[PDB]
Amino acid sequence: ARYLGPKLKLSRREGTDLFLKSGVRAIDTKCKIEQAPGQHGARKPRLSDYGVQLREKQKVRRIYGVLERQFRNYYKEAARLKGNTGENLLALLEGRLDNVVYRMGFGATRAEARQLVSHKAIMVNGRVVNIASYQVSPNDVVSIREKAKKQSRVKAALELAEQREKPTWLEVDAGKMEGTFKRKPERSDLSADINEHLIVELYSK
Amino acid sequence: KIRTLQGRVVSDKMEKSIVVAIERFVKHPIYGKFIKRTTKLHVHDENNECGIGDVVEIRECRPLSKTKSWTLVRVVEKAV
Amino acid sequence: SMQDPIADMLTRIRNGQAANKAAVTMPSSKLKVAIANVLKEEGFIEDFKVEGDTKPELELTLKYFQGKAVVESIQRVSRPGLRIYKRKDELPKVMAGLGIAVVSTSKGVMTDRAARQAGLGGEIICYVA
Amino acid sequence: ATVNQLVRKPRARKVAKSNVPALEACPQKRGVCTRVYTTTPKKPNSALRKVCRVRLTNGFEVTSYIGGEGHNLQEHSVILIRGGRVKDLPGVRYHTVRGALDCSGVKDRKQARSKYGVKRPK
C-alpha cells in the first residue's frame, strides 16, 4: 500500500516543500530542492492544463500520504456532503487521525505519525485505534498510551512541533501528551498554497 | 355510485349484444402529444334496443360470453 | 391558414421590436387582451388599447429603454400541435426568475411567480425573457 | 421531424455490427492452426507479417497475427486467439495470445513482458 521510495524526490518533482522530512535541517541543505529529479531534471518544459491539474492532485496526495483509490473515495464523499466540495475534501483530509496526531505534535512527519498510530500507541476516547485513516470527530480526545508514553521520539517530535506553527482548532497539552480536537478546520485555517479547485475540476472530468 | 364508461356504438348486428368504442385522450409517454386511442368492447344489450351511432353508458359485470363482460346501463342520444 | 393567434401576436411584437416600430396592431381577442394586460403589468409594454366594435383592433405601444428594445426574447411554448401543462411544482423559471412565463391557470391568466404563490399551475402560453 | 410524424415512425436505432464477429462475444477462443505463413502489408508499409489460418471451435476459420519476434507454431498447434486487428493487413482481425496453450513466450524480453508471456527474469 503505502509509498516506500525516496521522499525528497517527491518534493523535488513538485518543486516546493512537502514536509516529508523532519525539518530539523533546511531542505535545500538536504538536497537540491529546485531541480526536478532524474537525468533530464535540469530543463523545464511547459506543462498543459491537464499537467497542472494532475500535478496539484499528486501534490495533495503526496502531502497526506493517501493513495489514489482512497483519494477518489474521499472526493466522492466530499461531493456528496452538502456545501463546498473542495472545503469538504480538505476537511476530511485534515480529519484523518494520522494527520491529527501529526499536527498536535506526536510525530516528526506524517509517516512517523502513521507508524505511531499503526503500532498501537495512540488512543481516541480511551480506546486503542489501530487505523491510520480513522476519521476523528469534533470534541474528541486523542492521547498516547501509558506504555508508549515513555518513548524518546515522542519528546523529540513534541519539541520539533513546538517551534513550528500551532493549529488553533486542536488544543494540545504536551505535559500529559493529550489533545482535544475542537472543530473541523476552515480553508482560512489551512494552507493557502494548496490550490484547491483543480482537484475537483479534475475528478469531474 | 358505480364505475361507468360512456362510449359510442360501432355495430349492433349480433343478437342481444352491441359493440362500443371508448375513445380516450391519453398523453403519449415520450413526446407529450395527446393522442386519441380507442378501445373496442363487447357489451350485453337486452331487448336489442340500441342502434349504431348512439351514446351508451356501460358498466362492468360478470362474464356473460367468451368475449362479453359489460352490460348496458342507459342509452342516451339515440339520434340517427 | 391562421391557426395560432397567440403565436401571431408574439410574432408581431417580436418583429415590431426588431423593426423599431413605436406601436403594433392586431385583430383583438379576449385572450390576447389578457396577455397584453399581463405584459403591461410586468412592464414589457408601455400601454395597450382596443378600438372598434365589429372587428376590434388591439394596439400595443412597444417600450424601448436606451435604443435597445426591452423584450429581448419571446416565444410560444404550448403550440397547438403540442400543448404543454405543468403542475404547481414545475412552473418553470425563465432566466432564473428574471424573465416571466405567462401561465393560464383556473383563476385567469397570470405570471408564473403569481401562479406559484397562489399554489396552482396550468397551461403555459409563452416565455418572455 | 414533427412529433406527429415521430409518433407514427419512431426513431429506429442504429444497430452496430461488431468488429470481432468470430468470437461470439467471448474474450478469447481456442483454435487449431491450419497454415502458418507470411504476407506483405499494404502500400505504406513493407515487411513480412507472420500470420496463421486458425480454425476456431465454432467452425469459423479466421486469419490471426503472430506478434513478437519469432514463434514455434505449425499445423495442429492449438493456440488461443483474442480480438484486435493489425490494420495494414487486410484480412487479419485477431492476435494470438502469446504465452498460452502452445504459443511459447517470445525469447529474451525485458520490458512489456506481460503482453508477450515471459516469466520474470531472475
Add this chain to the structure above:
Amino acid sequence: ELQEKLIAVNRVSKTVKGGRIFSFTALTVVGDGNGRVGFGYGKAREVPAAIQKAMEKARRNMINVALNNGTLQHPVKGVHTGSRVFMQPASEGTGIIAGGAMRAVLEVAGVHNVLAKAYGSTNPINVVRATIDGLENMNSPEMVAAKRGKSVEEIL
C-alpha cells in the same frame, strides 16, 4: 495587473510561386478577473511575434461583463458561426467545468463556478467568439429592473 493566457498557436501556409510560405497565428485572451475580458487573434511569421501581436490586440477590444461573485447571473446560450455554447450558473465551489477555449475565457474573466458545454463545432476561434458574445448578452437584476421600470425587490 491584467491576467493573460494564450489558447492555441496554429501554422498556416500561403503557397507562393516559389513555394509554401509558412506563418504562425496565435490566439490569446486577457482579462482583469472582475468582468473585463477580451480576446485577440494576432498573426505573424514567428511564434513570439504572433503572441506579442495578439496580446497587444487583446488589451484593446475588451468588453464588460455583469457578474455575480464569480458566477453567471442566469443561463445563457451564445452562438457564433459553427459553435453553440451553453453556460449555466453553478453553485459555489464547483470550479470551472468547461471545454477548451471556454476554460481559458472564463478563468481569465473571473468566473469561478459555471457549468458549460460546447455543442456544434469546437473550433477555438468560434468558441471564444461565441463565449464572449454569450457573456456579453447577459443581464443583471439591476439592469433588467431598470429596463422594465420596476424595483429589484419586485423582480427578486
Add this chain to the structure above:
RNA sequence: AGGAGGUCAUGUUCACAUAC
C-alpha cells in the same frame, strides 16, 4: 452615341524540414 458583316497520344513509384 444605336446595330451588325467576315494539328499536339502518353509520363515507374515513394520520398518535402523548421512549432518560443
Add this chain to the structure above:
RNA sequence: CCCGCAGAAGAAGCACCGGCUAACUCCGUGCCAGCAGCCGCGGUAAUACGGAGGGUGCAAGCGUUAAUCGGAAUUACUGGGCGUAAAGCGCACGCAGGCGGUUUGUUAAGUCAGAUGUGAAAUCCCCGGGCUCAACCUGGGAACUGCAUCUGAUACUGGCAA
C-alpha cells in the same frame, strides 16, 4: 479480542514515456526485424522497433481482450436538418388522420388543486446507531415521478347550443 516474547527482522510488482496523454537520453537495427487505439514510425544519427539508465501512473495488484452506457446534439421529446455538403415526392385532387377566425352560454372530458386507498420488503437518497475505521449491517424518514376514487375551479383545449 487482550496480553507476553524475539527480532527490521517474513512481505513490491505491472504498464507507459511521438501527439492525443503525466513522463527522455544512449546503444543495437537499417522499409529488415518489428510496433500500432487513431495519426503513423522503420530505407544509417529512430525521444514511435529491441536493450540499458532515468522518469511518470497505478499498487497486491497491474495490463490486454470481450460487453454496455457516456463523450455521440452521431435516431436530435428535452436536443438536428433538407438552395449547393445526405435529404422537398414530377404535379395536382382527395378519403381516413393532424390542426381550427371571433362572441355568449352550458358541461366538466382533457387540465389544475385538495383528500383517501394503494404504489411489498430490500435497493437509491437524508439524518442517526453498531462492528477499532471502512466496506458491511441497521433505526426513522423522504422518494417510489404511477393508478383508481371522491370533492372543488372554468383561464385554455374538447363536447353541445345559439
Add this chain to the structure above:
RNA sequence: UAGCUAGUAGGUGGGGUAACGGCUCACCUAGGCGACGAUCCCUAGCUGGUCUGAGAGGAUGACCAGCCACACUGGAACUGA
C-alpha cells in the same frame, strides 16, 4: 408478414365446474378481429431493481425478493383442502 377466423362471433336449452363462461353439446342467427397493425415469422421468462447518464433516456434482468413455467421426451388421470 394483409387480410385472418365454422365452436369461429353471438342467442335459446341440456350437461359440466367450487365458481361465471363455447367449458362442452344440439339448434338458431352471420357474425368476430384487423392500419390504434389482425394473422404469420424471428427472438425472449416478467417485475422490484443493476450499470451508465446532469437529466430525459439507453443497456440489462447474475446474486437478494415477488410472480410464472418445467422436471429424460409426449400424453393421462387417481389420491387429496
